Ligand binder design. Structure first.
Ligand SMILES: NC(=O)c1ccc[n+]([C@@H]2O[C@H](COP(=O)([O-])OP(=O)(O)OC[C@H]3O[C@@H](n4cnc5c(N)ncnc54)[C@H](O)[C@@H]3O)[C@@H](O)[C@H]2O)c1
Ligand SMILES: NC(=O)c1ccc[n+]([C@@H]2O[C@H](COP(=O)([O-])OP(=O)(O)OC[C@H]3O[C@@H](n4cnc5c(N)ncnc54)[C@H](O)[C@@H]3O)[C@@H](O)[C@H]2O)c1
Ligand SMILES: [Cl-]
Ligand SMILES: [Cl-]
Lengths: 478, 482, 480, 477
């Protein structure tokens, strides 16, 4: 019929071609010989085996990285505009294999294909294009200094950069770190999460195809306590970018000073409050806060369970809020109709349910859902809680799964104080129609980023270092 | 009960000590010996006489600025941070003689003394201080160019800058043109308006005192067709900054192209439409809309007489606004209770009246006022027009006086399309509590500046760009590395 | 091993497909029906006829651009990042058809094909790609202001932009104006030079093909006094960008001021003196000072003919230079061995010869060349001059042709004063290994740009194509 | 010829300020403990100062926190006002310039006229400079895909902890207090234990100038106590440290084990000097000389090593020995002294044992070599010759009146040698050859490179970005 069925479609015939270590544009086997399994979070099944990299592999990776960054290097003499062209060529290859890549992100990470294809991958391509445009626009400056002097600065690449990311948005994270860093001229030694190194490894292929000189990007799959720690402590690594759990960041900053005091960056958790006001149109408020709390199986750090709602509407919202969760299609990620895929791990799976129990046995009125779904996979039903208070464990601890707490507040000053209670880290999503309330909240919110009625230049600053030069001149004249 | 007048007081009948041309930190008489009167718009009585500059005087002024800007010059070798120290020192003096400068301001422009003291002179001091901090923070860049090259850019002063400003905010205008230009290292030949040259001449005194090298700032009171025209057509002036009527704006650019292609900046008037949605606190909207329309005697490019009010509340707004006018205190600018002083001239005066007559004799419902006040000075009573339509003349012609027109609208697009109708130039104030309306309206407004729930005296980093030119240098290097 | 593996060539008698006015992504014919010829500067022969635009034509183009910039507009709602992709797509299309484009550039302006291919179109493609990147990186700011307020600024496009450019680098010039403007969201009404509009119109074809909304780019071939004058006086163009002679520049600003006070930008000529000190590698210096004086047939504002050499090396330099000219290959621009092409006009041609003679009849020592070459075309032989002094007409007037004048000098304070003396407009190139001389000079040269040990004339460029809109909101209580 | 004097020390300077400064109040250490401060020229005790510890550092933070809380005066203060305060602070410093330079010259043993004309010049200058930055710190409006509007605000971090050395007490204190205050932060600064006077004094000025209570807190004391108390406090948002790398490692480690606060480290580093034969031997010798002996050599911005090109290695060493040979070492308050004492006995010994080391390894001790007399920590101007990369005095850094003079031949040589450094590097090159100046300046792995001599990025570590994006009905360019 007129069914426009033809749309993005995954690929069950997806056989993982890239499962080895990527160093100096070559696919190597782990020095030890060890190999680690990669599992499909929707069926419990094993997708394939990947070469487990360790201390030794990290050394070679770093060696190629430093060589690729040396003064002779093709990566060091290459015009900046060319680095951009390469980031741009890479973006083109990502578009070409957009499906097979979006498939791994679905297959390997359990994220509903249509979402992996239309959201995640859009970002991957978007950021690669965007940063490709920054390469030759990174500017230094000439400074007017007292005295017969002429000083000026040049922003230069730090050198060898170590990167370590989580499993929330495997490809996206990998890109968000690769682009900025390459953009600035650095060389990379990136360690993807152990439960999601596929798309990362695939990018390695595209990178070599795009034309990046050997040694610029090195991808070493393996375990955190091993490879990730060998990086965070490696002596010949100038900087390190980490993003994941706070408890592990501490080990990173500490191993940083211990080693060689290399520059360090940590992208840590943080709670994600939401403050819906009575003046906001209930309908739109519900959907958005519902998508903001359930997106990416609710297990994404950029999500936020807690949802402060104004009393005048606390009634309806709760009811509407549960109707949605009820109709939410949870199924196989390859199914174009499923909205919620499985959780990433059994370890993760339990930590969620285990916290769902806490709530129930503490006053939280379970409005719907509450337990897992079936055999295999790691699905959990859309859980919505009611009558929640700040002293509960489900309100204190963040729920990294399909669980949304609905709280109630009366005064403004209130929510501001309640939502600001966060020990480092915070993101807010206010919903109003009142310029004043919006302005006040977005200001009083001790949050790194605020959204009003919805749920760049500062990026490539940590991937470059300043080099000032000052020259004595015969006589100075403005 | 313990109410004492701690309040600042306008020095009684100030003695105008400065009335001559200011060149090379020296006070000269007019080459021709000509002279022109300065008058009190509040009484219509003369205040003093000022030397009259002309072609020949402008010429000596340009020679002065030129020499003060040459390669060896103290002003050219001075550290940027020192120019900053000078702008700040000048700010100190303005603060010291703040009372007498606000006195001339009020005495020559007929503006309420307390306003000239707390608003105008606050700004004078503020902008001076502000640019002082900018002097050593103007940076250039280093660019990554393909090839084994290294290019960079310095931001250097332009040279001699001619400046011409109006009578609306004599001291503010003078300051806004001076600070940025000196800040960047230029030399100035500035021509105040013929009706308001005093406050400016006094600044010449403080400039010499502060420490500015001779020739850096040259002030020449005089007329447009002569003094101003000689500046615009001058073969030795590198840049000219003008603010005033668009009619004269055209002569300035033409003179420029016809003479030496000097750089040209034009600050022209324009309409300043107001939009009041029914969801805005009606009380605060009447005060603000009233303050933005009748401020500085309504005669100020930054004031918008026309006011679009939403039907749902048109009724009320018209009533609240007339009360405000009736209670509007209009008196001698030295009385600390006067909220409105006289219009600047008889010419201005007449233009407002005859224009007001039009409205009345065309449909507009004259809610109140409509004629002048007593004898002496150029005071006009707070007029308020209602049932005004776009087609009307008062609607198409701006009202540079104590006159406000209230119009009614229904849809949003309407207000927007209607308000947007203008020719090159537009400032706009909007009042709502609806974030969406504020946003739609703020973006859709073809204006250079938009205020949301406030008016404020209109017109940073973008300011000192016009007072400096870019110089780039690219060096061939052995090999380019990251 | 005799590797006759070659592969870079024009196109056999190219058929000029695009010769009509380009409005609203549509090819029109002049309202009047008038037409002007375009000629091959090498043969003197006619290449084709182009529709000649005038007042009326300009009006429609302005109308289409106007509509293309109005609120709801497709080009106005487009994401900035999308405007950028469009410029990148245009870059791609320019890459695909690079051969035909460089052919026209050569065939129409008379510049050696190989140079047009590897230089001019590299620039076109490079600039297009470059600005395609700036599109979503034009930021405004949040300003810490006094009181309980919050002010922020937005850099919006100006509106309808007229653009008028010369024949020196047809495609390069065109690109340099289009990219910055489109990159900022404006709409354009562009008028190429009467002697070189082909590459221009072809770009119109590519523009439509790339995806640009109709009305965004309008291209109108025609004459200066008519079409160019109607753009400068048009009551509905918000800004004009002109590059050409200072004499015409003067007229542009006047018309600007006498009409609607549109923004005006003038890219005028100027002198481009070079300075050569004994400490520089005489060999290298001669090679750079040579290309930079004979490049683009010497008729490139981005390069002067005057060269100040230090007494110590003046001798060897004069000989080193003459030997270079003597070995310069002038001939058909389609022949890959040719370095120098024909001058652009009969008019420009005579102006060069009359000027050469002048030098001869005034004392300058003609070391070589001094007259045209053969019949057909406007070629002039590499002409070098020795013993030249400032007071000489040739020294005072620019020699927009294949002619280098070599002036002698001794003290630094000297050259620095001589090089400077100029009425609005200066660019300088200095060769030395002395950080000191290089410094004193580069900071003393009243030039807009200065080259040290090289010679071949960003963020500030996309500033003239956008204006500032500052918004400020009143807020309950302000906190840092 | 009859002459006159004008620039002079505050006679028999008495120390009015010796307590801890918290909430614009002078408190006594909780423990009640007190520590001494000494004159490095004589060795005698100048006075005693209250000693802060974990519990004191605790009150300060409470003070700073409250002073940074929303409603606060300092948080609502127009940004232009923070600048006026800084400027008034610069004025108050100009007024008491003489006595401040006195303490700096009496506490750290630096020659008064330099402490007056140099050190204090920088204190006032940098205070004036940042005064001017306070209302010019901008965020941006970013064009975003979709119907959105996103903007950023550069806001102050909050509570900053500062720890500086004794090389330039006041300057250091100033360089760290200015940017931070300029950005709206509140401070808890800990001066070195051997030089707290000038700092504590500034405390009085800060209060006099009008800074609200709790914005700045000066807690003098020891590092393993006060310094660590700061580094680990759970309520300090950011920490700025400048000093030795060995302690830096403890700093970063501590901040990681605690609350993951931001950490900055201004650490050591060698300051090589390369001199070519083409540079003017005269200028070159005097410049390299002043650059290695300034502040008595005991200052990070001083580099012992001085690579000289063979062609002129001869004369350079001679002209240099003559220089050292005529350097006047005397009392800090005598207008003719060019070199005061070393800050400490501990630092004193180190310098000597390191001098003996060189002599005992091949170095050709051209002049000087030992201390001077009794009382004080003076050390005669030392100058080595024929030094090689392997020699200890060359590998390790000499923070005293000691200058080495290595020899070299090719450019590639010096570039490789001088470049050899494990994190941290600054360099000076002398030539009249643009190329060498370029090849070298870009090949040097230094944060800064000086050529023929020896801002905006500063106010960046004291603020964070807060991006906000609003949904709008429909977007238009
Ligand atoms: O009307 P308005 O009174 O508000 O201001 P205006 O436009 O008449 O005049 C404003 C300023 O422009 C000057 N001016 C007037 N005509 C001039 C001319 N012909 N050429 C050069 N300068 C001229 C005035 O003297 C004044 O300083
Ligand atoms: O050379 P230098 O010897 O002056 O450098 P240093 O690191 O010994 O001294 C610099 C500053 O760091 C402080 N400090 C010392 N050890 C510390 C520690 N363990 N943790 C926190 N603060 C400490 C000092 O008291 C001083 O204020
Ligand atoms: Cl004329
Ligand atoms: Cl006319």
């Amino acid at each position: 019929m007129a069914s426009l069925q033809l749309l993005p479609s995954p690929t069950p015939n997806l056989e993982i071609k890239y499962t080895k270590i990527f160093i100096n544009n070559e696919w190597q086997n782990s020095e030890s010989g060890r190999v680690f399994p990669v599992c499909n979070p929707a069926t419990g099944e094993q997708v394939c085996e990947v070469q487990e990299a360790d201390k030794v592999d990290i050394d070679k990776a770093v060696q190629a990285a430093r060589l690729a960054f040396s003064l002779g290097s093709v990566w060091r003499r290459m015009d900046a505009s060319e680095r951009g062209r390469l980031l741009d060529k890479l973006a083109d290859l990502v578009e070409r294999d957009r499906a097979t890549l979006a498939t791994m992100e679905s297959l390997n990470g359990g994220k509903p294909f249509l979402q992996a294809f239309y959201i995640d991958l859009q970002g991957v391509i978007k950021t690669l294009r965007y940063y490709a445009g920054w390469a030759d626009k990174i500017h230094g400056m000439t400074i007017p200094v007292d005295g017969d002097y002429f000083t000026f600065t040049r922003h230069e690449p730090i050198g060898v950069c170590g990167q370590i990311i989580p499993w929330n948005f495997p490809l996206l994270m990998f890109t968000w770190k690769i682009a900025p860093a390459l953009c600035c001229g650095n060389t990379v030694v990136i360690k993807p999460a152990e439960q999601t190194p596929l798309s990362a490894l695939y990018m390695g292929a595209l990178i070599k195809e795009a034309g990046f000189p050997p040694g610029v990007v090195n991808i070493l799959p393996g375990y955190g306590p091993t490879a990730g720690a060998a990086i965070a402590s490696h002596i010949g690594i100038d900087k390190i970018a980490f993003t994941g759990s706070t408890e592990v960041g501490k080990l990173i900053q500490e191993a940083a000073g211990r080693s060689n005091l290399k520059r360090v960056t940590l992208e840590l958790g943080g709670k994600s409050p939401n403050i819906i006001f009575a003046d906001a149109d209930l309908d739109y408020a519900v959907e958005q806060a519902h998508q903001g709390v359930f997106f990416n199986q609710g297990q994404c750090c950029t999500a936020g369970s807690r949802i402060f709602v104004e009393e005048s509407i606390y009634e309806e919202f709760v009811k509407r809020s549960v109707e949605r969760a009820k109709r939410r299609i949870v199924g196989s990620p390859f199914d174009p109709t499923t909205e919620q895929g499985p959780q990433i791990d059994k370890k993760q799976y339990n930590k969620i349910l285990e916290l769902i129990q806490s709530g129930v046995a503490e006053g939280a009125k379970l409005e719907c859902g509450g337990k897992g779904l079936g055999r295999k996979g790691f699905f959990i039903e859309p859980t919505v809680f009611s009558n929640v208070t700040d002293d509960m464990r489900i309100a204190k601890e963040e729920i990294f799964g399909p669980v949304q707490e609905i709280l109630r507040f009366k005064t403004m000053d209130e929510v501001i104080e309640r939502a600001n209670n966060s020990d480092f880290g915070l993101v807010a999503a206010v919903f109003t129609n009142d310029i004043n309330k919006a302005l006040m909240v977005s200001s009083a919110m001790q949050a790194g980023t605020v959204w009003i009625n919805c749920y760049g230049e500062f990026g490539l600053r940590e991937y470059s270092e300043v080099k000032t030069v000052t020259v004595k001149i015969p006589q100075k004249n403005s």
